[PDB]
Amino acid sequence: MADQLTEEQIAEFKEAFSLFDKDGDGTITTKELGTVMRSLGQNPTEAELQDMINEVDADGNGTIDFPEFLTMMARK
Ligand SMILES: [Ce+3]
Ligand SMILES: [Ce+3]
């Protein structure tokens, strides 16, 4: 019906995570990360990304989730 800050807000962020998540599986790997970058005009190696993914992923699953990525947004 409408939107709203707080939790509701996140609902929106969902889409954000999608941008990066080109798998729609619910996770953001490296490639998927080195993809959207094309929009910004970037394209780091699988090494850098890994570090970037290991900058939010405190679980060390190797990939990035929605809640693990949400933090990335909070940053900047
Ligand atoms: Ce994915
Ligand atoms: Ce993770």
UniProtKB/Swiss-Prot annotation:
A GO molecular-function annotation: calcium ion binding
Compartments in which it is found: Cytoplasm; Cytoplasm, Cytoskeleton, Spindle; Cytoplasm, Cytoskeleton, Spindle pole
Residues involved in Ca(2+) 1 binding: D21, D23, D25, T27, E32
Modified residues (N6-acetyllysine): K22
Positions of crosslink type Glycyl lysine isopeptide (Lys-Gly) (interchain with G-Cter in ubiquitin): K22
Positions of post-translational Phosphothreonine modification: T45
Binding site residues for Ca(2+) 2: D57, D59, N61, T63, E68
Annotated keywords: Acetylation, Calcium, Cytoplasm, Cytoskeleton, Isopeptide bond, Metal-binding, Methylation, Phosphoprotein, Repeat, Ubl conjugation
Subunit structure: Homotetramer. Interacts with CEP97, CCP110, TTN/titin and SRY. Interacts with MYO5A and RRAD. Interacts with USP6; the interaction is calcium dependent. Interacts with CDK5RAP2. Interacts with SCN5A. Interacts with RYR1 and RYR2. Interacts with FCHO1. Interacts with MIP in a 1:2 stoichiometry; the interaction with the cytoplasmic domains from two MIP subunits promotes MIP water channel closure. Interacts with ORAI1; this may play a role in the regulation of ORAI1-mediated calcium transport. Interacts with SYT7. Interacts with MYO10 and MYO1C.
Protein name, as recorded: Calmodulin
Residue range from the parent sequence: 2 to 76 of 149
